[PDB]
Amino acid sequence: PISDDHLRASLECTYVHLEAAERDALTANAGTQLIVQHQAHLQQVSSNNV
Amino acid sequence: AGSLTQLLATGSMDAALTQNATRTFWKSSYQKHSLFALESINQPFTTQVQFGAESHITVNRQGDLLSWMYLKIVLPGLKVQNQADTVQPTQQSFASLDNDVAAQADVSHVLPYIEGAYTEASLNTKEQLIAEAKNSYEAAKYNAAPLPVAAQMQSTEMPDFDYAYWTEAIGFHLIKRAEFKVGGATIDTIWSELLFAMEELMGRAGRRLTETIGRTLRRPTELMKASRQEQILYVPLPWYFTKHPSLAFPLVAATYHNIQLWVQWAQLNSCIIKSRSNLVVLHAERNVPISDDHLRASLECTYVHLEAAERDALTANAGTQLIVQHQAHLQQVSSNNVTARLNFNFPVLEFYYFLRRKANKDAGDHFNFSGIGGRDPVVSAELLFNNTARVTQKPAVWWRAVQALQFHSSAPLTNIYSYSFSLSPEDPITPSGSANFSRLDSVELALTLQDDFGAAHDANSELFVFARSYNILKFTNGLAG
Amino acid sequence: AGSLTQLLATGSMDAALTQNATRTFWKSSYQKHSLFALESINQPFTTQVQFGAESHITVNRQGDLLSWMYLKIVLPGLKVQNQADTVQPTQQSFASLDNDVAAQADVSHVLPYIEGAYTEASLNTKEQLIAEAKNSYEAAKYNAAPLPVAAQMQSTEMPDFDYAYWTEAIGFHLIKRAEFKVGGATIDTIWSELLFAMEELMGRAGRRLTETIGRTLRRPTELMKASRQEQILYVPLPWYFTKHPSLAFPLVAATYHNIQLWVQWAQLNSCIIKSRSNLVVLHAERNVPISDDHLRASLECTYVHLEAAERDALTANAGTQLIVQHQAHLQQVSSNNVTARLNFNFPVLEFYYFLRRKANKDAGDHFNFSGIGGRDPVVSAELLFNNTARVTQKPAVWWRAVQALQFHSSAPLTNIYSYSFSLSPEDPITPSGSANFSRLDSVELALTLQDDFGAAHDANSELFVFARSYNILKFTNGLAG
Amino acid sequence: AGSLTQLLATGSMDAALTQNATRTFWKSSYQKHSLFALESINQPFTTQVQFGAESHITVNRQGDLLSWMYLKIVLPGLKVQNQADTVQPTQQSFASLDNDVAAQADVSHVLPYIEGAYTEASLNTKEQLIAEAKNSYEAAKYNAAPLPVAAQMQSTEMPDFDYAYWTEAIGFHLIKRAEFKVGGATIDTIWSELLFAMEELMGRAGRRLTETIGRTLRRPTELMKASRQEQILYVPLPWYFTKHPSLAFPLVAATYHNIQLWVQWAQLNSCIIKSRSNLVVLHAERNVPISDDHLRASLECTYVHLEAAERDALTANAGTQLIVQHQAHLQQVSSNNVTARLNFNFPVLEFYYFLRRKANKDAGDHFNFSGIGGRDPVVSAELLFNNTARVTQKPAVWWRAVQALQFHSSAPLTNIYSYSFSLSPEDPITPSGSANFSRLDSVELALTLQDDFGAAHDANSELFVFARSYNILKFTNGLAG
């Protein structure tokens, strides 16, 4: 019988290896990245007007 | 002459205790406080509440602070009917006392010690042979002296009628997980198993949560009586802000963040035990099969209303609160030697651990942390930091009874073990010791369990480890993080 | 390396907790105090002590402060004799177990649900029909699932011999009312029902008043055993000055006022329960019918003796003490909907309420606050200020268990309900919240009671509401007011 | 409008409580502390551990402070064999239930009240005659009403099999005396009887030492079950430094003194009770007669590790600690009137007293402080200073229940009496009253005991009086005194 322990998962990550000069520059001054974040509003619906 | 002579009989040692005394026993002094009021308000969930589902509520802003928080749960009364008499007999399976999986698992460990024709024996003869084999097993494994067979034959006087009941401490069991969220970030997480462990250790005498969570101290006849009618449970949610008035969550200081409680509910099949396997469980009032939509819950919150001057001061400068967060390591157990790698972070105050047999879980006895035959499942434990013994090997009774005696308001009635790095881990406002697990490369809890723990019918027994850690919640410009 | 690294692993957040630490865990500091002594002194009443009478005592000035106060009660042992064997059978009537008015009242509510020839039935058949009618009544009123008839037939194993006993918690029941007076003014008033409610909520685990007040937790066989011999009871009088040493009543500062305790005693007929209606109750030692003059009481006071310097300082400037006073609203109940108009004054900390059935009172079970068939007499309650909901409608369990869990040292074993405006209503020296009832035009407690509460045999059931309020006692020029 | 009006409704009286408020309920403040860690370490005795011997341990220096201290005791499981079946039947005598010396002593007091042919009567007739003679004795001595004979015939359902068990609270009974020594000087001494009395009075609800000391609350069947297997007991040693973190013993400040625990062990013959006189008691695992070398014990100490800055500060200036020391007056009782001359020294906080019948001691019921037939052994007591009544004659219930209610965390379940000169004798850091016995020429505790106490079979009953006194421990230049 299929059971909850039959799920298997792993994480596949792509790494970037840099030249020493770029690695050292990034370690000294990575600064700031613009990021996009996600937000959620989840609601139950029990009427035609919501 | 004697009482006046005692007041005159002072020396240089008394000067350290009584010279320039700043306190008297014969005059009361009191402090004035600011004006405030408390209001309890019940609020419905924002999503549908159902067994096995996740539901959330956005907490209303009906005062300036949030203090106490209770999950108000309403469970229907239960009735039973024979499956043969039911127009729609198809229901989820429930644990049943005619199929005691925990007793069958215990018998399986003593089968190698049964002498004679067990398979062909009468029922009364099988019970005798099992009790004798228990003595032989316990003599072989524990060097135990044999108990008289008559003392092992405890008939639980089960009633000669059909019933179903909600499991022990159902108010905690229903809450598989709850998350306190602010601005979409999880601030803290609590688990059913942690709530029970916290009540065992920190539950004060005369203020135990018994009725408020549907707990009878394993008296099945009281669970049956309670389960015949509608039950209203008030399950306290022990967040950092519910522990002391000075930690009350400042709603006014977090104006731009939604405050949410998320609750993952237990599956209905795990919540009910029945007398017999062939019974259908009915809603007692509606006379329909019990279903996942029969769970009702709401959130009861205590709001604090402040005077305008204190409200304005708190809005301008709420600053930072010291908080306690909970962390969990959950592991399956399939061997008598178990090493738990505790990947917890921050300054840990203390941790709790305990084991649950698969057979106890399958029997619906979710808070039975006992071993085989009701014994202590832990023989010994050791705590290692970076492969160095922080606590050398100690017997189960030291982790269960000595740690509880030193640091907790109560000793656990179940096999819950603890260890504190704090002198007062129940003080929510005064740090009194910690170990910073974010600075340790490895933290290992090594356990030696009882013989045959996690073998055969108990394959995939559960180890729970919960830690309490310090963090800081910051309030700035109407935001909290 | 790890433990030293933890002490070095500090940041800007740790500065708020540990920078300039004013406390260490590794060195004890103690404060010196002034010299004092405690003396316990027993004092007789100034008037005769008798059942149903009022008695007073003028408290002696045997020290500088008054701390603890206990009513020392001596009750004779009880014996019984048949009325036919007694030379003077004329005595007051006592409640008797052969005439259980509470059980008869419970049967009266289920009479409409008895199917078949009840009047002509055998005794065993009548007991069966009553248990079946209880299931039909509870199904109709509460949608309750039926209990097996055998589970409702609890025989209390009553002894097959004649007895009489003092009622449960007789030490409280004897004190219908006590008044603490200073200079002829009543400073505070306590009631039997309030003393019991205070012990239920504030009674600490391992320090319950059981033996000291003649309380057995409703075990009639223990009341019988205790009642065969003389009983000495020490009933604590929970005045403001008995709660903390800094509130001890300054006798030296009140030199020109008499301090008096007034006690209204319970009637003898209410204090005793007997096995049978035809028994005469005798004083066990004297072999005479028990009479109103067999009550003995004295006052045990703990005095504090101060050093001359502290005594002189207290005489010169005793100033003001924060006090808690008690207020009462007592009402008859004749309907399932009850509104109590709470005409209390001052900053109210909290209130308690509970109901007593007429049948429970008439049966001599004075502290049985249960409803019909031992159920919760309150379904729900609401608190209104000026017709605005201060607390919206909440179920009985919220007022009984959630309020006790939040604000009290204990949860009540009886149907006592509370509500606190204070965060710590048991702290006698630190005000932690109140509502000023002298500034409210109306305070209403609206109750929905169980079905048929206050109907028929329970006409004139009692509602008790008690409030705790802050006031100030001032000491000036040898006077107190 | 109402809640804002309450904040505005302030007068000159509220100014004393709320003007310039230094505290808010709506914002938590916390203090930062220094870095520390706790480590529990188990250590073997320096000498052999045996029943009836004295053993000592030199406490290791594994941290900077010493906090908690537990005596870890390991007792073997017990089995029994008939003396006829044993190759070496010669063992020490143990108390046996077929020779109940306590019941025989109780019968001896009622022999003068037996009417009829007792010597020739059947066993069942002798039990009836003894129960009737008990009623006649109690009527004559106490004016007691007779109990029904059937209510006095309590059969303790003793099992119909052979057993032996360790006596009630064996973990305390084993410790006849323990001495905490520093530099060869005794700093404090504790006794078995004092440890039990301290747990009765100061043992908190939900933290009673039951399992940790082998205490069942006089349930012989639970002692039997526990005694069939190896028992590990953790007996807390309640030294001054175990009571509060600020009193932890500064190991670094006492560098040139050895710290020693000395323990005088109970004799093996006093530790065991058996079902029958003709049984040999065996070690359950080894199958050899139980002997004095089967006692195993070790010392479990909690060390505190300090940050270098706090360690260096404590080494430079540990100063002085306020300590509580224990003193004992032990007396034989051979009369109903007893005067104990209390030659105690220093500022006494409080004292405890209790009596043990010779018959209870000989029966192996070492913590049974009851009188004849389980009654209270004290009728009244008086305390005299220099022949002047400091406490006038008071009944036993005042010394047992009123003193415990006023000053202790718990009321004793046994006949332990106390008296406090301190308002808070359980506070280890705040002196709250004392009487300096080194300045009194005489301190006398006068006791009136029950009739026939210390007569006949109870000749050489024991009176225990223990006092708690303040002293100062000084640390200077690596020495402690």
Lateral strand order in the sheet of C259-265: C54-58, C259-265, C175-182, C185-191
User: Would you give the DSSP letter of residue B201?
Assistant: H
Q: Are residues D318 and D253 in contact, defined by beta-carbon separation less than 8 angstroms?
A: yes
Q: Quick one: which of D390, D371, D375, D369 has its CA closest to D437?
A: D390
At CB < 8 A and 24+ separation, what contacts does B193-198 make?
B193/B354, B193/B356, B193/B367, B193/B464, B193/B466, B194/B326, B194/B328, B194/B352, B194/B464, B194/B466, B195/B235, B195/B238, B196/B169, B196/B172, B196/B367, B196/B414, B197/B352, B197/B354, B197/B412, B197/B416, B197/B464, B197/B466, B198/B238, B198/B352
Whole-angstrom Cα distance, residue B283 to residue B77? 6
Q: What are phi and psi of B113, to 5 degrees?
A: -105, 0
- Secondary structure of A2-50 as H, E, C letters: CCHHHCCCCCCCCCCCCCHHHHHHHHHCCCCCCCCCCCCCCCCCCCCCC
Give me the residues of C, 20-59, that contact B with CB < 8 A: 25, 30-37
Whole-angstrom Cα distance, residue A28 to residue D416? 74
Q: Are residues D423 and C245 in contact, defined by beta-carbon separation less than 8 angstroms?
A: yes
Whole-angstrom Cα distance, residue D141 to residue D152? 18
Kind of pairing, strands B65-75 and B231-236? antiparallel
* Residues contacting D101, CB < 8 A, separation 6+: D95, D359, D362, D363, D457
Q: Quick one: which of C26, C210, B324 has its CA closest to D248?
A: C26
Tell the burial category of A34 from Cβ atoms under 10 Å away from its Cβ (0-12, 13-18, 19+): exposed
Helix, strand, coil distribution of chain B in percent, nearest 5: 30, 35, 40
Tell the burial category of D10 from Cβ atoms under 10 Å away from its Cβ (0-12, 13-18, 19+): middle
Largest CA distance in chain A: 62
Chain position carrying tokens 């072989």? B140
Distance from CA of B162 to the nearest CA of C (A): 9
Q: Are residues B145 and B130 in contact, defined by beta-carbon separation less than 8 angstroms?
A: no
Ramachandran sector of residue B149 (left: φ over 0; alpha: ψ -120 to 50; beta: rest): alpha
Q: Are the beta carbons of B320 and C16 separated by less than 8 Å? A: yes
Q: Which two tokens stand for residue D250?
A: 């500064």
Q: Which two tokens stand for residue B367?
A: 């808070």
Adjacent-strand bridge partners of D82? D279
Whole-angstrom Cα distance, residue B430 to residue B424? 8
Q: Quick one: which of C407, C455, B42 has its CA closest to C416?
A: C407
* Residues contacting B104, CB < 8 A, separation 6+: B359, B457
- Secondary structure of D42-88 as H, E, C letters: EEECCCCCCCCCEEEEECCCCCCEEEEEEEEEEECCEEEEEHHHCCC
B232 vs C: CB within 8 A:
yes
Q: Which two tokens stand for residue D351?
A: 């004292």
The b-or-e profile of B115-142 (16+ CB within 10 A means b, else e) is eeeeeeeeeeeeebbbbbbbbebbeeeb
CA angle C373, C375, C381 (to 5 degrees): 140
Q: Are residues D400 and D388 in contact, defined by beta-carbon separation less than 8 angstroms?
A: no
E strands, B76-209, are 78-82, 95-96, 164-166, 175-182, 185-191
* Residues contacting B184, CB < 8 A, separation 6+: A39, A40, B258
Other C-beta atoms closer than 10 Å to the C-beta of B217 total 10
- Secondary structure of C162-178 as H, E, C letters: CCEEECCCHHHHCEEEE
Q: Are the beta carbons of D16 and C435 separated by less than 8 Å? A: no
Q: Are residues D360 and D103 in contact, defined by beta-carbon separation less than 8 angstroms?
A: no
Q: Are residues B212 and B233 in contact, defined by beta-carbon separation less than 8 angstroms?
A: yes
Q: Quick one: which of B410, B393, B390 has its CA closest to B401?
A: B410
Establish whether chain A is in contact with chain C, requiring a minimum of 3 CB pairs below 8 angstroms. no
Whole-angstrom Cα distance, residue C231 to residue B54? 60
Q: Are residues D375 and D144 in contact, defined by beta-carbon separation less than 8 angstroms?
A: no
B contacts of C6 (beta carbons < 8 Å): 435-436, 439
Q: Are the beta carbons of B244 and D24 separated by less than 8 Å? A: no
Whole-angstrom Cα distance, residue B199 to residue B178? 16
Cα–Cα distances in Å, from B365 out to B170, B267, B356, B357?
Answer: 10, 14, 9, 10
Whole-angstrom Cα distance, residue D206 to residue D184? 38
Chains in contact with B via at least 3 Cβ–Cβ pairs below 8 Å = A, C, D
B48, B184, B460: residue with CB nearest A44: B48
Q: Which two tokens stand for residue B435?
A: 């170990």
Ramachandran sector of residue C346 (left: φ over 0; alpha: ψ -120 to 50; beta: rest): left
Q: What are phi and psi of D329, to 5 degrees?
A: -120, 115
Q: Which of D28, D33, D314 to mutate: most C Cβ within 10 Å?
A: D33
At CB < 8 A and 24+ separation, what contacts does C408-411 make?
C408/B207, C408/C201, C408/C202, C409/B204, C409/B206, C409/B207, C409/C201, C409/C202, C409/C203, C409/C204, C410/B206, C410/B207, C410/C200, C410/C201, C410/C202, C410/C203, C410/C204, C410/C205, C411/B206, C411/B207, C411/B208, C411/B211
User: Would you give the DSSP letter of residue B402?
Assistant: I
Tell the burial category of B83 from Cβ atoms under 10 Å away from its Cβ (0-12, 13-18, 19+): middle
Resolution (A): 12.0
Q: Quick one: which of B385, B405, B400 has its CA closest to B445?
A: B385
Q: In 3-state terms, what secondary structure has residue C241?
A: helix
Q: Quick one: which of B183, B162, B195 has its CA closest to B263?
A: B195
Chain position carrying tokens 């100034």? C46
Q: Which two tokens stand for residue C156?
A: 């209390």
Gyration radius from chain C CA atoms: 27
Helix (H) or strand (E) holding D224, with range, is: helix D220-227
Kind of pairing, strands C443-449 and C378-385? antiparallel
Say how many residues make up chain B.
481
Q: What are phi and psi of D339, to 5 degrees?
A: -115, 120
Chain position carrying tokens 């008033």? C189
B10, B36, B285: residue with CB nearest C433: B36
Q: Which two tokens stand for residue C1?
A: 């390396």
Q: Are residues D40 and D276 in contact, defined by beta-carbon separation less than 8 angstroms?
A: no
Kind of pairing, strands B272-274 and B95-96? parallel
DSSP D349-377: EEEEEEEE-HHHHHTT-TT----GGG--S
The C-alpha torsion from C248 through C251 and C257 to C262, rounded to 10°, is: 50
Gyration radius from chain D CA atoms: 27
Q: Are residues C171 and C229 in contact, defined by beta-carbon separation less than 8 angstroms?
A: no
End-to-end CA distance of chain D: give it in Å, rounded: 66
Distance from CA of B48 to the nearest CA of A (A): 7
Tell the burial category of C126 from Cβ atoms under 10 Å away from its Cβ (0-12, 13-18, 19+): middle
Whole-angstrom Cα distance, residue D474 to residue D319? 6
Count of alpha carbons within 13 Å of D436, Cβ hemisphere only?
16
Q: Are the beta carbons of C205 and B206 separated by less than 8 Å? A: yes
* Residues contacting D25, CB < 8 A, separation 6+: B33, B34, B36, B245, B246, B248, B304, C423, C432, C433
The single-letter code of the amino acid at C246 is: S
Q: Are residues C40 and C302 in contact, defined by beta-carbon separation less than 8 angstroms?
A: yes
Distance from CA of B26 to the nearest CA of C (A): 5
Q: Which two tokens stand for residue B332?
A: 């399956």
Q: In 3-state terms, what secondary structure has residue B474?
A: strand
DSSP D256-280: TS-EEEEEEEPPGGGTEEES-TTEE
* Residues contacting D440, CB < 8 A, separation 6+: B2, D385, D386
D contacts of C15 (beta carbons < 8 Å): 32
- Helices in B179-268 by DSSP H: which ranges? 192-202, 210-213, 220-227
C contacts of D313 (beta carbons < 8 Å): 24
C245 vs B: CB within 8 A:
yes
Gyration radius from chain B CA atoms: 27
Residue of D nearest to C43 (CA): D392
Other C-beta atoms closer than 10 Å to the C-beta of C285 total 16
Residue of B nearest to C304 (CA): B26
Distance from CA of B55 to the nearest CA of A (A): 10
Kind of pairing, strands B78-82 and B279-283? antiparallel
Largest CA distance in chain C: 93
Helix (H) or strand (E) holding B234, with range, is: strand B231-236
Distance from CA of C370 to the nearest CA of D (A): 27
Kind of pairing, strands B259-265 and B54-58? antiparallel
B contacts of D3 (beta carbons < 8 Å): 37, 305
Tell the burial category of D160 from Cβ atoms under 10 Å away from its Cβ (0-12, 13-18, 19+): exposed
Q: Quick one: which of D218, B212, B169, D57 has its CA closest to C403?
A: B212
- Helices in C258-332 by DSSP H: which ranges? 308-316
Distance from CA of D320 to the nearest CA of B (A): 10
Cα–Cα distances in Å, from D378 out to B171, D371, D456?
Answer: 49, 8, 18
Whole-angstrom Cα distance, residue C8 to residue C388? 57
Q: Which two tokens stand for residue D36?
A: 């520390």
Q: Are residues B16 and D320 in contact, defined by beta-carbon separation less than 8 angstroms?
A: yes
Tell the burial category of B359 from Cβ atoms under 10 Å away from its Cβ (0-12, 13-18, 19+): buried
Other C-beta atoms closer than 10 Å to the C-beta of D8 total 9
Kind of pairing, strands B185-191 and B231-236? unpaired
User: Would you give the DSSP letter of residue D307?
Assistant: P
Q: In 3-state terms, what secondary structure has residue B284?
A: coil
Whole-angstrom Cα distance, residue D31 to residue D49? 46
D contacts of C300 (beta carbons < 8 Å): 398, 402
Helix, strand, coil distribution of chain C in percent, nearest 5: 30, 35, 40
Q: Are residues C395 and C402 in contact, defined by beta-carbon separation less than 8 angstroms?
A: no
